[model samples]
Target chain A: GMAFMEKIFPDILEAIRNEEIIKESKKIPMPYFGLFALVIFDKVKGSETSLYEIGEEFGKMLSPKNIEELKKIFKLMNFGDLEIDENKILLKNPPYKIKLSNPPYQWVSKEEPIHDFIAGILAGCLEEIFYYYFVVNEVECVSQGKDKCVFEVKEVD
Target chain B: GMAFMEKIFPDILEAIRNEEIIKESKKIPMPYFGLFALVIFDKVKGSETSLYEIGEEFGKMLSPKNIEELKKIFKLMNFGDLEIDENKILLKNPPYKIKLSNPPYQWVSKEEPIHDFIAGILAGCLEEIFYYYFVVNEVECVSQGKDKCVFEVKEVD
Candidate 1:
């Protein structure tokens, strides 16, 4: 994941340099986000809900008017390539694919998908754009060795 | 804090550009760190313990052999100027001083010190340097409208 970030950092920095909205923003290493996610899951009960809610709050802050704006927001956030496919939100090369369960840091389980916060963000974004509540579920995750992270978005009843 | 980062970003980028170890490192906005801290405290029981342990792990990864290296590491991490006086570690402008409970985001308490993770990092660095366990407490925090963040470090038996 660090390698991926290394490859993509220049473009993201270039974007930040040119973009007015985030020109003054400060940045930290990408691994910390994964580490934070691991800590949230390890230490919190009902961790998914907590993470999702935080993501939802973040998504709301973006306040994107449409899918295009949402896509741009994700790109700016360095979430990798985001695609809206019907009811599915697909992500390629997300920064969260790091192996927190790797040697020297077995902080997270290797079996479970680890993008609940991102799914929540998708739910929040879809809710804003569609004018309805939505529930986003990460059915596949690169952290779990999947090729892509797939969030299935459904209308909340 | 964003303002501080904006002011110091060029120096950091210049450092990254010149420094070999962190040349490939990728960065995310600093506000997310505050947001993550807020989430950890809000949703996790014994949140400080969790954050501290994470910081400890990060400090160990730095593997600094002495105070100067540790200070350099903290500077590189953008934790602001780190100084050691007697048993106290002082930070003049730590990045975790953001008002997370500000308008639009009331994710954290306004009255509490919010740099437990940083305290943990200090503890870990001290432990590695001294070759003994230590407890680092956040005695002061800028997040609570204080001018500086201070960590009182004590040896653990």
Candidate 2:
């Protein structure tokens, strides 16, 4: 939830680079979770800000009349994000997953990238177990590699 | 002083590219007031920061636990900027004016590119006008061509 920003950064970045991180999200059933859901979430979520939107929005904030509005936030939370399609949201991070079979089902898919099957359970764990919450401090700017940002996470009061 | 961000941007940028858009502002003495302010101050200010600290010693404000904090007065103010030095600021956009002279003075001794000096002034202005008021929005990750940033600048009421 909070650290989703970090978790979502890497994959999203890759997607962005490939022009795959579009508004569409693909959510599949995650069987197991791993280092990805934990480590990379924060950077990723914050990076989710639309390049055009965030860029222009920040420009407006810097205007003489609105700069103060941006500085007033406490801690910026970084919650992982997924695109919603119709009534459902897609899980792009954990690219693929195993269907519901309960206890220990081996993933079997044709022409799947390593991330598409094994470590892909992150989507389920995040949506089902860890969709905590996020707060973003300063979403500076968006670039391909050298992006700058921070997300703060805290329990609901 | 605060509105300088707006005025300085187009002017300095025009001055840089030698464009006609901000040509009029180039006539003014402080053509690059906002741009130079950040630069001159930056030297004394030292390098930029990503995890800059800001909080405490406030008169009024809200706890930035959520995005709502982004709208508070205290949260938006910049208070810890380096302003001891006032000369390092460069005046790019406006053609230089030496000793308050309309066209000041210049010797083509070095023959360097006639870059817009006002751009530097904007940096100085930002550091002076808003650096202390807001927390670090991230430094080295420069995105905008004019070291552009949308910092929170609240005027005194």
Candidate 3:
């Protein structure tokens, strides 16, 4: 029971586990795999690149016609339930995000919305559909103590 | 004409390209995926664990018996040539390290040996055979103006 990534790429688990082995050896567990990997994945970019832009451009590159088509792709990847409503996208417990907002008090103490990677995915998928920039705000997040992870897709200036 | 990673996982190109698209929109080019990804991969760990240890741990997890066997894996993966010596492992223009040291004076200007990931692979592969820690040094690197990338594996304390 893990992300689609682990199943598809077994080597990735080795890479991840190597990192965990180091952490385990050091007796540190704050990062805790799932959310931590995403944090590092974003951090390693060495710049402030929006995950939304990355995801959207990626979607566009894949040539998905609309949000519905994008939903199908995500579904195939077992990302999560994607419900679209007239310029609004609701991702219920998406991949790289389902457990991000749940446990792990150390992150919640930061007092801000987490799940940057998943949020980036949603914004990116929508952007490719409209062929322009879009603003996605995680007005509600399970990581931020919200019962659900609600992202609002808004018009870009 | 692509990275080894992209060849194995078609989706990897999409992920890297998405990052590149963001870079284009932002007018930056230093990362270029090869070296930068390694930088991030190592940086995210935020510890002093050796790449050799990381690679070796991961290799054993994959059931590689020795450096020679690891070479088979790399060769199959089209990494590059791997020539073992009495005291060193000669990886001629190894993966993620071939063009790394040659281009863009930004890295060459650093004035020191680089290529932690590649060095780690050599050390890790050897460790599985010896069943002990070994110091793998990048004494010769393209980044350091060397024609080839050589890893000098040594005994550890």
lDDT of 1 by residue, B1-157 (tens): 1222111122333333334534344555555455455444444433334557767765664567888787776655656667664233344422222111111111223465666667777778777887878777776666556666666667667
Task: Highest DockQ: give the candidate number.
Answer: 1
lDDT of each: 0.53, 0.21, 0.41
Q: Estimate the Cα RMSD of every predicted model relative to the unseen true structure.
A: 13.1, 23.0, 16.5
| Candidate 2 local lDDT, A1-157, one digit each (tens) | 2222111122332332221222222221111111112111222232332222222222222222221222211001011121222112233432222221111111212121122111122222222233432122222211112222222222221
Candidate 2 chain A, poorest ten consecutive residues by summed lDDT: A72-81
* DockQ for each model: 0.14, 0.01, 0.04
Ordered by TM-score, highest first, the candidates read 1, 3, 2
lDDT of 3: 0.41
lDDT of 1 by residue, A1-157 (tens): 1222111222333433344534345555544445455444444433334657777866665567887787776665655567664233334322222111111111223466666666767777777887877777776666556566666666656
- For candidate 3, list the clashing residue pairs, or say none: A56-A124, A101-A143, B101-B143
- Model 2 sits at a Cα RMSD from the real structure of 23.0
lDDT of 2: 0.21
Clashing pairs for model 1 are none
Candidate 1 to truth, TM: 0.52
What are the per-residue Cα lDDT tens digits for candidate 3 across B1-157? Answer: 2222111122222332242322222111222122223333333343333334444543443345765565554443223456564233343322222222222212232345555555665566566776766667766665555665666666575
Q: Write the per-residue lDDT of candidate 3 for residues A1-157, one digit (tens) a residue.
A: 2222111122222332242322222111212122222333333333333344444444443345776676654443333456555342343322122212222222232245554545565666556666666666655665455665666666675
Instruction: Point to the candidate with the largest TM-score.
Output: 1
